[PDB]
Amino acid sequence: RRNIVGCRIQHGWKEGNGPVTQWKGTVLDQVPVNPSLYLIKYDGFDCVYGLELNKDERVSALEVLPDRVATHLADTMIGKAVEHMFETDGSKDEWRGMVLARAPVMNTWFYITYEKDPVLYMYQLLDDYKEGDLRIMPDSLVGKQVEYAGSKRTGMVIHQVEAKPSVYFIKFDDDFHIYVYDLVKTSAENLYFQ
């Protein structure tokens, strides 16, 4: 029943005439308002990336990898402000952020973003919670073109956060991160829509 979404993939990646690097990951989603755009979680890397696979010249040798193995309660986390600790070099540190949603295909994972890096991250937050590294704090425009200017940077609104309807995901044409914005906050004050 799977085509590309839900599959593990491998491909090469090449910027300029630089070296080709090999990447392995899991395709999380094909974006409804832009079916060319796939969201990808690369093994060992924590951000969610968007690539327009069918036209990005930097992608080479795309292949589907076989699954090596066959394929609730923590829903209460969704929408919660959190403090997420991590090991630095010894010292431990923390970023504060917001749990956005459960991740699409990798069941036990969660979308999360942070004030110090307001792009889309993905973590096994229930594990982190059990290890004492996640403190829980006490408690449309999709498909529209967006620009901000800070040269004229253009993109598209690809998702609205169900748990927090003023929060949206934006894919800018010039980058492969997924940007998260709360449209009522200062971080969004230079975004304009069409």
Ligand SMILES: CC1(C)C(N)=Nc2cc(OCCCN3Cc4ccc(OCCc5cn(CC(=O)N6CCC(CCN7CCCC7)CC6)nn5)cc4C3)c(OCC3CC3)cc21
């Ligand atoms: C142990 C584990 C898992 C757990 N169980 N829980 C956690 C929790 C962690 O923290 C939670 C808070 C959020 N954290 C903190 C934090 C602090 C510093 C950070 O620094 C990043 C600086 C950096 C990184 N790059 C690389 C880069 O940009 N690339 C370009 C794009 C490339 C892919 C796309 N391409 C490929 C081809 C197609 C396009 C990849 C390379 N460049 N600069 C980042 C963070 C995130 C946690 O954090 C990580 C550890 C270091 C602190 C770990 C865990």
